[PDB]
């Protein structure tokens, strides 16, 4: 019987290419548009991924939809942080192998302020020397990081699935073979990074929502993203979102 972490590993989506032509000069508008198109394709792959996470398909179909719609930005920004961590280590934002925010791209107007919340994710993964097994558990936990204020239809099963992956994160940490005290510290550090993703996402969604809503910017989103964005905007407005935390404020 395979281990649960090996099952999470085998379903990890293959890295997608942006289809960005390097022979054409850069513009922030061109990069934003290309990234929205890439994001749509990454979200189609994220649906196929979530369906293969052991336990996910046992939740009510409405809960499956709810979790993907709440967590979509957290999943993209976290996987982006991982790719940036593995690829550069310098570091740069590595959206796709053909679309990296290199030093020349960083000179675009206000580029650092547009990238710093995402660069923080990769910087922390690097600082904490997060492993591939820890990362797989952490990303699954991000899919399970927000619920409606009144809860899910399959709340008991969701809590059991969530606890299972918290314990899986524990197993990955123990492999770093530190003492009981070092394991507790590492669990605290990794779960603090998980909590900080809610704050990273609020910044990214402020940008995403502004560019989606302001039609005078001529910033296109593919159907996959436009559908999730259209669904999420009223939920943020009416406070129908419970952000789950490992550490109380």
């Amino acid at each position: 019987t395979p281990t649960l972490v090996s099952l999470l590993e085998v379903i990890e989506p293959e890295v997608l290419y942006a289809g960005y032509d390097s022979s054409v000069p850069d513009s922030t508008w061109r990069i934003m548009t290309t990234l929205n198109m890439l994001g749509g394709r990454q979200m189609i792959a994220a649906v196929k991924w979530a369906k293969a996470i052991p336990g996910f398909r046992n939740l009510h179909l409405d809960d499956q939809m709810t979790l993907l719609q709440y967590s979509w930005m957290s999943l993209m920004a976290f996987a982006l942080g991982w790719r940036s961590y593995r690829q550069s280590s310098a570091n740069l934002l590595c959206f796709a192998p053909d679309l990296i925010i290199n030093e020349q791209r960083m000179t675009l107007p206000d580029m650092y302020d547009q990238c710093k919340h995402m660069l923080y994710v990769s910087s922390e993964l690097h600082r904490l020397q997060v492993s591939y097994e820890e990362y797989l558990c952490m990303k699954t936990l991000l899919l399970l990081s927000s619920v409606p204020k009144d809860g899910l239809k399959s709340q008991e099963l969701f809590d059991e699935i969530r606890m299972t992956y918290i314990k899986e994160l524990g197993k990955a940490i123990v492999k770093r073979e530190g003492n009981s005290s070092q394991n507790w510290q590492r669990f605290y550090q990794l779960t603090k990074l998980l909590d900080s993703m809610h704050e990273v996402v609020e910044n990214l969604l402020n940008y995403c929502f502004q560019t989606f809503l302001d039609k005078t910017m001529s910033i296109e989103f593919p159907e996959m993203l436009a559908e999730i964005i259209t669904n999420q905007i009223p939920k943020y407005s009416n406070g129908n979102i419970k952000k789950l935390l490992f550490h109380q404020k």
Binding site: I44, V47, K48, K51, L61, Q64, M65, L68, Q69, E223, M224, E227, I228, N231
Partner: peptide, 13 residues
Amino acid sequence: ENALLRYLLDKDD
């Protein structure tokens, strides 16, 4: 409505 996400979740794969 969320037609596309529902379909991706309902279809095989």
